[PDB]
Design a protein around this ligand. Structure first.
Ligand SMILES: Cc1cc2nc3c(=O)[nH]c(=O)nc-3n(C[C@H](O)[C@H](O)[C@H](O)COP(=O)(O)O)c2cc1C
Ligand SMILES: Nc1ncnc2c1ncn2[C@@H]1O[C@H](COP(=O)(O)OP(=O)(O)O)[C@@H](O)[C@H]1O
Ligand SMILES: [Mg+2]
Length: 147
């Protein structure tokens, strides 16, 4: 209902061990950005398009979850871009267009099942983003302003 959702934010570090350890880096936005999501953007896994600073637009998956740590029930958001970056981009602006919903959050009983799930979400996102209604969002002026 609030898709496609467009937002931009500084890329910031997270806590615990980064998902770089899984070969699947996940970029965070400051709390200010996540707080401005409409409530109807429920938790779960979404897919869409992203660029960093003035770079090209690439396919991405976003995880929207509950934060265990802040007062009230604050959400969290983290984006994995399906593009190999030559270096990190902390502090740069990540521009995102969230275009579709993949699945609700799920509980997994091992890292094996978690990693397999994430890889499957990525492969499914790549397929869904080829649909003409989603492929066109790559060309949105939203992304053209950043170049
Ligand atoms: C596409 C995608 C889907 C995810 N799905 C789930 C999920 O269904 N359930 C869950 O508990 N964690 C899920 N995660 C969580 C990541 O494994 C977790 O947030 C990890 O700690 C990344 O944060 P980090 O940068 O601190 O490592 C998902 C992550 C991604 C990228
Ligand atoms: N494909 C990519 N998608 C998301 N982040 C990437 C990607 N390639 C490199 N990065 C870098 O990885 C960082 C995320 O790594 P991660 O291990 O998840 O740590 P953290 O969540 O604490 O920032 C991003 O802030 C960014 O600088
Ligand atoms: Mg991360």
């Amino acid at each position: 209902r609030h898709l496609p959702y467009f937002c931009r934010g500084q890329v910031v570090r997270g806590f615990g061990r980064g998902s770089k350890q899984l070969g699947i880096p996940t970029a965070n936005f400051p709390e200010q950005v996540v707080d401005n999501l409409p409530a109807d953007i429920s938790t779960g896994i979404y897919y869409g398009w992203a660029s960093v600073g003035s770079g090209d637009v690439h396919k991405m998956v976003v995880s929207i979850g509950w934060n265990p740590y802040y007062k009230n029930t604050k959400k969290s958001m983290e984006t994995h871009i399906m593009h190999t970056f030559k270096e990190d981009f902390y502090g740069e602006i990540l521009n995102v267009a969230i275009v579709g919903y993949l699945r609700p959050e799920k509980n997994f009983d091992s890292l094996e099942s978690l990693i397999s799930a994430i890889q499957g979400d990525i492969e499914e996102a790549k397929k869904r983003l080829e649909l003409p209604e989603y492929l066109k969002i790559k060309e949105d002026n939203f992304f053209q302003v950043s170049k």
